[PDB]
RNA sequence: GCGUGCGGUUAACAACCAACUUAGAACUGGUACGGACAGGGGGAAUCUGACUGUCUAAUUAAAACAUAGCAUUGCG
RNA sequence: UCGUGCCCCGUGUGGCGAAAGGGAAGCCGGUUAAUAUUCCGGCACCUGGAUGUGGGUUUUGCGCGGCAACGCAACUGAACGCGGAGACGACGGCGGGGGCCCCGGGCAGAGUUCUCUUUUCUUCUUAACGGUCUAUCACCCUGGAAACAGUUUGUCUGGAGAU
């Protein structure tokens, strides 16, 4: 797993061809939001403060990329 | 503060092996555990590595020497008469 | 008598250019604020010209006679002075202390050093300077 | 004789003791004499001879070790090589 | 809380290839983790000192890292240390100079012998 | 034990001039009281170097240049034919015949004394450590000096364990049972 | 917040924090106080083998054997 | 191309022999009546191969920076050589790190409660793999030490350059 600290790098990673899926994790106790994109080798995580602009980053993400919110319980 | 009156380094052997044998082993142990002045770098750091092998801790030079002393009197006399013979041969 | 003067040939003993031959452009014995010790401004050879044989073609000779230079500020303790001297008119004040503060000035200085050194090498003189030291 | 001359130079003139300061004196060109002890490593001995050949400085090969050279300079430490910058009242340079 | 552990492999002997360390899992359980032997620093071929700037790895792990990480940007870098390289440079220069001096002296002696013979 | 302690094979360089080697290591040899010296020589016929293993004479050191051949100097560690040395020179690892790479005076503190030369038939009279006199061909080589490690047997072993450690790496029979302590079926001294 | 040029060694002072040993004293119960457990009897001598070590698995563990030390013989 | 040849090199010789020696690479969670570092989920790694994209280098053709120790994502390298790693005893005390043990506070649960006990006990965890900032030895630069200094529990180190 790798942490991406730059929005431009994260957008390029999400525009890569092997980007199979992406998910959004919300941690309200720490007031943070994580964008995780699954590629062939690595899972890339961008960590942001929970904010409206962080919500609008989803619209700048590519539309063909499937994006899902993480539920509160990981059911098997 | 002298702790023993005569046995010295031979006190580790206690009352065993005989007084004369402890006295005989003492001289070799003292010479083989002493530190010697290096003839290359001048520091007092030459110690025995194995039997006949003397190494300097500072300049890392290793020298072939005597079994329990760095130099042997027969070897020193050999060097002297060798230098005499070399002078006679060259001149 | 002092020997660390201009046109003195020295060997670099430490750093990325250790073993290379340099010619002293400017001696600074008293030191500066940035380098508070005796040092020198030198120009030298990073890549020596290759050997030339009698059956080589002219294009191959021209390709193998190229020289890659470098310029350097170097401490006196990292130099080994040699009795050789290399007097070049084109290298007079090719570098100064302010040359090393700007990347483009280093480029222009290295181009000038390359031109002058290749001229001297093609002349056939000072062959010891252009042969590499083997160690 | 060299020991008495060294003692007189220590008393009156100016010296530097040691390899790095001797090299600095040879680079400055104000070195008048270089003394090199017998047990100095041959590479350092050749380097000191080359520096003295460049600076036109005389070299005396001291027959004692670095211990003996330090004692002759009047110190309680060893000295492999030393440089005389001012002879003082001695005549060590005239030889 | 159960604090005692077991080997996770079929070797039950405390050999040099059977090194373990204790971890606590995200499941809250104490467990062993089999670990490899420590890497060894490369050493200078002249003096034997540990070469600074070079990682200490098991031998085949060096095939997985890039060239600048395995070496020092200097002649003999990653094989000989800086002091030994400086000694090599000074020794080579001085010995070649002495060879030229001896050749000059030999030529002068040969010329003197030829003049004496003639 | 890695390599046997032998001279170089007798070649053109040692027969007609000298060759220089450098002493790189002085090492302990298990089962042998004398230290060994690893000396690196050049091969005259190829680029690769040759490593040799000599018995180290006293005074040899790492970084020392030694010289082997007919014209080598009379200095400790140098290997010369006996015809090139004066009378009274002590040597070690003396060849019985030229090219056998050394046979005589090999243990610690021991040496062979060159007593005389007979140049007419090319022979050399030598004295061995046992006091015996011998005649060898004058082209037999020997290393100038005395084998290092002398005085080893002056120290008492003092302990059965030290004797055991000495003989376990040597393969010699230890402990030793007396014949008279045996039954008559085992030893003629038995009973 | 760093740079100097100074000036002073009563910080011998304050604030906060922390653990286990050692010594001394009063009081007090007593048939017992290393309260169970754990844990040398000591001494005078003689013979004997120097010592540590080893053997007769399944009747003998020893003054037997070995040992270091000493002596002799053979071998270039 | 006298087309049906010529040149270079030297070291020998094959195999078996270790589920405790050497050795490329996997962790966590869950799952069965019975297997699990093997299944399932998530997250990785090694070895080998092919061939692209980005980035790098180059018109001073094979990078640049630092006095230096050396650094940085790259940054040509056949034959023939040199070196390192693999690769190494036993014992003693000292220092660092993980885990365990121990103490205090807090939320939740449980037990005790004639009296006492703000009480006694239990859960409070974080893997491989990576990024980043640091960690004894050692090494480099300045400078030149007797009124010798630094310094370990253990007396070693320094004009061969200490503090
Ligand atoms: Zn030394
Ligand atoms: Zn080195």
UniProtKB/TrEMBL annotation, chain A:
GO molecular function: structural constituent of ribosome
GO biological process, one term: protein-RNA complex assembly
Keywords of this entry: Ribonucleoprotein, Ribosomal protein
Any one Gene Ontology cellular component term annotated for this protein: cytosolic large ribosomal subunit
Region (Disordered): 59-76
Sequence similarity: Belongs to the eukaryotic ribosomal protein eL38 family.
Name of protein: 60S ribosomal protein L38-like protein
TrEMBL record, chain B:
Keywords linked to the UniProt accession: Metal-binding, Ribonucleoprotein, Ribosomal protein, Zinc
GO biological process, one term: translation
Chain sites annotated for binding Zn(2+): 38, 41, 56, 59
GO function term, MF aspect, one: structural constituent of ribosome
Cellular component, GO annotation: ribonucleoprotein complex; ribosome
Signal peptide: none
Family statement drawn from the similarity comment of this UniProt entry: Belongs to the eukaryotic ribosomal protein eL43 family.
Name of this protein: 60S ribosomal protein L43-like protein
From TrEMBL, chain E:
Presence of keyword Transport: no
Family: Belongs to the eukaryotic ribosomal protein eL34 family.
Sequence positions that bind Zn(2+): 44, 46-47, 81, 84
PROSITE patterns: RIBOSOMAL_L34E
GO terms (BP aspect): translation
Domain of life from the UniProt record: Eukaryota
Keywords attached to this entry: Metal-binding, Ribonucleoprotein, Ribosomal protein, Zinc
Molecular function per GO: structural constituent of ribosome
Protein name: Ribosomal protein l34-like protein
Organism, as annotated: Chaetomium thermophilum (strain DSM 1495 / CBS 144.50 / IMI 039719)
Gene Ontology cellular component terms for the protein in this record: ribonucleoprotein complex; ribosome
From TrEMBL, chain F:
Keyword entries, A-Z: Metal-binding, Ribonucleoprotein, Ribosomal protein
GO terms under biological process: cytoplasmic translation
Keyword ATP-binding among UniProt keywords: no
Location of the Large ribosomal subunit protein uL2 C-terminal domain: 74-191
GO CC aspect terms: cytosolic large ribosomal subunit
Residue positions binding Mg(2+): 172
Domain spans labelled Large ribosomal subunit protein uL2 RNA-binding: 1-68
Example of a GO MF term: RNA binding
Domain of life where this protein originates: Eukaryota
Family under the similarity heading: Belongs to the universal ribosomal protein uL2 family.
Name of the protein in question: 60S ribosomal protein L2-like protein
Source organism of the structure: Chaetomium thermophilum (strain DSM 1495 / CBS 144.50 / IMI 039719)
Residues of the full protein shown: 23 to 213 of 254
